[PDB]
Amino acid sequence: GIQGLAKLIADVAPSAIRENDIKSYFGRKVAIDASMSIYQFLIETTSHLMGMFYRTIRMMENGIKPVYVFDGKPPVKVTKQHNDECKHLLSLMGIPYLDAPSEAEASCAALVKAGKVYAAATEDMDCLTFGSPVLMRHLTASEAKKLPIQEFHLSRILQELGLNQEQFVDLCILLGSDYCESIRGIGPKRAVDLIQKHKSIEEIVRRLDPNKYPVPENWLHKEAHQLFLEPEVLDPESVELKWSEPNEEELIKFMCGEKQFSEERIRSGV
Ligand SMILES: Cc1ccc2ccc([C@H](C)Oc3cn4c(c(O)c3=O)C(=O)N3CCOC[C@@H]3C4)cc2n1
Ligand SMILES: [Mg+2]
Numbered sequence: 001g002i003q004g005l006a007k008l009i010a011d012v013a014p015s016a017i018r019e020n021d022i023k024s025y026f027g028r029k030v031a032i033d034a035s036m037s038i039y040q041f042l043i044e045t046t047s048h049l050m051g052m053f054y055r056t057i058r059m060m061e062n063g064i065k066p067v068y069v070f071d072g073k074p075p076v077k078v079t080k081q082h083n084d085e086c087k088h089l090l091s092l093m094g095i096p097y098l099d100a101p102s103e104a105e106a107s108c109a110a111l112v113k114a115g116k117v118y119a120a121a122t123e124d125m126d127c128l129t130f131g132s133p134v135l136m137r138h139l140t141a142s143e144a145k146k147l148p149i150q151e152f153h154l155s156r157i158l159q160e161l162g163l164n165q166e167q168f169v170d171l172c173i174l175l176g177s178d179y180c181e182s183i184r185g186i187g188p189k190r191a192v193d194l195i196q197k198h199k200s201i202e203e204i205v206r207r208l209d210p211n212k213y214p215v216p217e218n219w220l221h222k223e224a225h226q227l228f229l230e231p232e233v234l235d236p237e238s239v240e241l242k243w244s245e246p247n248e249e250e251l252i253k254f255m256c257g258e259k260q261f262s263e264e265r266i267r268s269g270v
């Protein structure tokens with residue numbers, strides 16, 4: 001995640017965010033961060049299946065064509081069983097899924113950048129740092145929250161901030177990422193100003209007062225910078241997204257027979 005990034009974009013580049021009704025995404029393909037979704041559904045339980053079933057029905061009823069992306073090896077805990085059960089449900093629902101080689105959000109970004117889908121759906125702001133042109137938030141949110149879809153357009157973030165993607169990555173590192181430490185005492189607005197002036201963490205560090213703003217020791221900022229700009233992602237040319245007919249009888253055998261959900265409920269959803 002990126003600490004304070006959504007708040008910063010709302011304060012300093014508000015035209016990069018649009019709040020939209022779910023009906024406005026008719027006909028669009030979306031790459032869902034399935035790993036972040038199942039985690040949210042979990043926050044033997046069946047809420048990973050309840051969430052995946054109902055939020056997927058919601059997307060399809062609004063004309064959205066979702067593809068679910070699952071995490072691979074890393075560069076409340078979601079288990080192999082949760083992922084396997086969700087994939088089994090997705091297959092019987094006729095919804096496509098992809099296994100990312102590493103972070104799902106980086107591979108959802110790759111699908112958007114390649115033009116395979118319109119947007120990446122995740123609450124994780126790392127998706128923008130990994131370079132997704134469009135990020136949609138609150139797509140899988142409970143109807144109890146009645147949240148609009150919060151869409152971020154990365155090009156307008158870069159445009160309002162007067163930055164390229166390399167500089168934006170260094171800004172996110174200074175904001176506080178999960179790949180390395182940030183510099184203590186430099187807040188979000190000061191980090192924007194420093195990057196706009198000096199462009200890189202390298203040019204900032206050679207200027208900071210070591211008495212005032214020392215940098216972390218064994219700082220992995222170069223490795224973090226490289227992972228965001230060149231992430232390990234799925235090859236979008238190997239992807240052909242297809243959606244098929246849900247298998248109602250098998251969905252009943254799995255959700256009702258094996259997982260004890262209501263038959264009338266599952267049948268009405270199918
Ligand atoms: C509830 C909630 C809503 C939004 C949130 C945004 C960001 C974050 C933190 C700071 O960052 C991340 C957390 N996670 C993941 C990320 O990539 C990540 O960057 C992730 O992939 N998974 C895999 C499945 O297991 C859970 C993890 C969750 C936590 C959040 N928590
Ligand atoms: Mg992340």
Ligand SMILES: [Mg+2]
Pocket residue numbers: 033035036103104105124
């Ligand atoms: Mg993730």
